[model samples]
Every structure is written in C-alpha cells, then in structure tokens.
Target: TSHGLIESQLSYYRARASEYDATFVPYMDSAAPAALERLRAGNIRGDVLELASGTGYWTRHLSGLADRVTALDGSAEMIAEAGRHGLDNVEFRQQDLFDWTPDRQWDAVFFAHWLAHVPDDRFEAFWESVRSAVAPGGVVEFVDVTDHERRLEQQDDSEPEVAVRRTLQDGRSFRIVKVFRSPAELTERLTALGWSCSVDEVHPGFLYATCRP
Candidate 1:
C-alpha cells in the first residue's frame, strides 16, 4: 500500500507540475515573504539542500541567502519548470526523495510542504536520511501547512491511513498521503529520533521549525 500510494502521489505531482504555482498564490503575500526572510536569516545559510523544491519558488530565495543551494525533486517536469527561472547559482537534481542517499552533507537542510506527504511507515526513516545529510552543527529548517480543513476538502473518511483525494485542474483525482501533525507532537517525535528541535505554528495553517542533532 505504501508503494502504491507513493507511486500515485508521484503521478499526481507529475501531472500537476504545470499548475503547481497556483497552489502557492495564496501564500505569496507580503507577510509570507517576510516570514520566509526571517526563516532564512535565522536558520538557513551556507551550503543548503532543499528537498521537493517545486517550481523553484523557495530555491530562488535560498540561492540568495546560502553560499550554495541544491534543489531536488522527483518530477522532471517540476525540475524543468524550476529551470525556466534561469537561476544561475542553484543546482537542480531530479531524484525521488524516498530513494535518495546523501552524496554529501549540508550546512542546512530545508523542505517546504513535503513532510506531510511522507507516509507514516517511512516517517522515521525519512528523518534518518535528513539527519545523515546534515553536517554536525548544521541546522534543519522546514515550513509546512497543517490545516486539514483548508487543504483537504475531499478527504475520504473510509481510509484508515492519513490520506486525501486531490483533484487537478483537468478533473483527475488522486489519493495522496497527508499527515497533519501538531507542533507539540512533531517536536516529541523528532526528539525521540535524537534531534533537538523546536517546532512552532507561526499562524493558524502554518508551521516552521529549526533543529540540530
């Protein structure tokens, strides 16, 4: 089931790549930019790795702050969309996060709106990869949306696992993993994994965190 769900999730994103920017419009307000700037100033710096770097939205910002930035995603179309931005300094890698093995460590690791998509079974292993990729004394920072009602209007209650059905612009639907985590719960889980972290819900629908090993 994990394999099927992950494959379906990948298919959904690959199909939605061209229209992914639409989902970001609501979060691109002035306050959002200010919050992002604060996050970068406080936690993101030096050599950075950005997982699930869709459409180069955050990658553009990261390239400005970090000495070097590598943006990775599973979808080729998403990577192509990011390439269209013509970022001179950032390196783009198209690789599935589930199959990812760190080639090198980074001073900071960042991902946005991606953790929720990781299935429950792989959550710990996902964090383990993250930990291994982070250099000693390095920081891990992430921003994600946790408001279930806002994001998943068509969630099926029949499903035992945490998942949601998302419809694309063309009316195609896909069931994808969507785990909503509270700040306290997430902090506890990370702590159990040997990470010293602080997670905070900056606003009603948003969460951000900074962590170290």
Candidate 2:
C-alpha cells in the first residue's frame, strides 16, 4: 500500500500549507480556467463535483459557473487550504477518492491532475465510482499530464528545487501507487464503462477529456 508514503507527503503539505502558492505556483501554470472555458463553449451546465481538489484552485474558479460544487481530496492539509479560499458555493471534503461516496448525484465530475495517481488495480472501480456519482446524462472531465518528453522539457536545470517544490505542492512527494495510462488506453477504459470519451491536448504533454454517460 502507498499509505505511508501518502501520509508523509500530507505531513509536508500540512506544515507548509500556508506558503503553498509561493512555494510552487511559479512552475504550475495550469490555465485551468481556459480549459474550463472550452467546456462552457459546449452547452454544458449543472453542478460540478471535483475529485482530488488540491488547495481549491479549480474549486475557486469553477464555483462561479456551477450552481453547486463538491470537492474532495485525501489530504486533510489540502482540504484546510481549500477552505481558506472561502468559496461559499463549493463544499470541500477530505477523504480518499476511492472511498468517497457523495450523498447525492452530481451533474459533472471534474478531475484535475489526478487520474494518473489511481492504482491500476482500482482503475475500473474508480471509474465506476465516478459513474455512480454523476446524475443521469452527466459528464466526467479530467486534466492530466500524459507526455513524458514534455514533462522533461518543463524542468529548469538551474534549480532542481524549483521543480521539486512544485511537485510537493501538488502532492507528488508520495509513492506513485500506480502507473499512468496512454490516452488511448484511458479512453478505452472510459468507453467500456459506457461513457463516450474524447481527449484534447491542454498543454504540451497534458491531456484533458470529457466523458458523457
């Protein structure tokens, strides 16, 4: 189990939560809002559910668009930081993504920088869980890094700490419990679950997808 490693990583975030943005934001240029803007371009509308809502970055931005948002993460520290952002429309919870079960269904489940971390053994379960959470006719959207070469390109040779800090801030100091999937593989998994899946390039190596049931 990667629990120990995940716990250690959370401890670091808890201790440094106050300075998280300063410590890591320089390298993370997500452009999450832009990706969401594209989502809005479609006729998509309804409440949003977020898995692995680290530090409320997406929650903060999506709150304005979605009528209601429920965001969850496994790390308590991350949840606390998210609360500090004070989004009335967003409800933040701390719980393992796999173990989490919402009280009611949601219109869309939004995932950011998270699919890669799910253990392969639990991949199907994870998707099933997402399917169970969504309202009928709902969609699942995700943003993740998929290109190995682009990952290397983003590195700054000058100070390894810069990249390291960003990694920690994003909660990756922990063990990688599972391997990531190629775009095709991920789409196949989603399709098997009865979803219509499609991937789009969000950045150099990052891939974003919206799956509809």
- Top lDDT model: 1
How many pairs collide in each candidate, listed in order? 0, 0
Predicted candidate 1, C-alpha RMSD: 3.7
Compared with the true structure, what per-residue lDDT tens digits does model 2 show for residues 1-213? 345544554455556566666654332476555566655654235788888887877777668778888888877778888898788888887777667556789888887777766655567777877878889887788877665434434653442221122245445553343343456767777787788888776655567788887
In candidate 1, where is summed lDDT lowest over 10 consecutive residues? 148-157
Model 2: lDDT of residue 142: 81
Model 1 CA lDDT for position 7: 91
Best-matching candidate per TM-score = 1
lDDT of 1 by residue, 1-213 (tens): 568899999999999999988776345453465457557565688899999998988888888888889999999999999999898888998898988789799999998889989876788888988988999889999887655343333554445576789888799999898887767768888999899987877766677788888
